[PDB]
Design a protein around this ligand. Structure first.
Ligand SMILES: *[C@@H]1O[C@H](CO)[C@@H](O)[C@H](O)[C@H]1NC(C)=O
Ligand SMILES: *[C@@H]1O[C@H](CO)[C@@H](O)[C@H](O)[C@H]1NC(C)=O
Lengths: 50, 50
């Protein structure tokens, strides 16, 4: 899913799904609200736990 | 809760609550029985998992 030309409030993401915590690389989930991005890509799938 | 003037045996903490593991900063849970502290503060609350 392509995400652009919008204001992203990542703090509300916790309300959408009951995930325990983020796993971010090269960035912190704490600072996501303070940054800008050219484009955002949301890749969704289902796998096994392991 | 203020904790002072007592001998603390942290190894028994695992019996009190069914928590999986500690999360310590600046110290290891392994060495807690070998140290002294001027005062201990226990802050209790309830939050969401995320
Ligand atoms: C997902 O959408 C449904 C209706 O399609 C809504 O009832 C539900 O609250 C939504 N989930 C969350 C976590 O808000
Ligand atoms: C907590 O206290 C109750 C009685 O108040 C006791 O039965 C129980 O064993 C205690 N919990 C633990 C983990 O020892």
């Amino acid at each position: 899913k392509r995400i652009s030309n919008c204001v992203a409030d990542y703090s509300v993401l916790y309300n959408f799904a009951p995930f325990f915590a983020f796993k971010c690389y090269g960035v912190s989930p704490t600072k996501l609200n303070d940054l800008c991005f050219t484009n955002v890509y949301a890749d969704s799938f289902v796998i096994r736990g392991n």
